[PDB]
Amino acid sequence: MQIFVKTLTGKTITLEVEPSDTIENVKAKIQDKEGIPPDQQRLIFAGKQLEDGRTLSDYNIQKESTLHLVLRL
Amino acid sequence: MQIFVKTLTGKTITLEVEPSDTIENVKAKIQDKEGIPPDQQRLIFAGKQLEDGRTLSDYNIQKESTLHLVLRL
């Protein structure tokens, strides 16, 4: 499944994920693709800051949803 | 544990706190560092305004969390 991860510069990254992936798994995939450590990543979806132990499906994130990546450091 | 406090101007304050500390304790620690009277401080975390009599643990504020400090008038 593809989702989009949008940075504050407007750059949109396409990421391959599974619909049952946890948020921590997604942060690991962003690390693998972009080189950003999970501790420096904050992900926001439709108003909410996403918590590491919950799945994408549990937030109603699906194919071609956009998550917003904020770097925190 | 250390927590951080960010103001509108970008100033960062580091405080030494225990999770059992009250919000009124945190405001008094901010006064010691910055000189702002506690009755002029408003603290925000996770979209919520923090109440003087509750504790940091009540709001799930953990090591290295960041709070936002606003001022009243």
């Binding site: 504050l8 904050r42 926001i44 979806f45 439709a46 108003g47 909410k48 800051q49 917003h68 904020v70 925190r72 | 509108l8 970008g10 408003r42 925000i44 996770a46 979209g47 919520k48 305004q49 936002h68 606003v70």
Partner: peptide
């Protein structure tokens, strides 16, 4: 005036006492 507000940069739902987003520091009143 007392309502929460969404950041136009990251969508986070912010408290009305903040005039910059708690997550990304984008000003509310751009």
């Amino acid at each position: 005036e007392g309502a929460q507000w969404n950041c136009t940069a990251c969508t986070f739902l912010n408290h009305p006492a903040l005039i910059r987003c708690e997550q990304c520091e984008m000003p509310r009143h751009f």
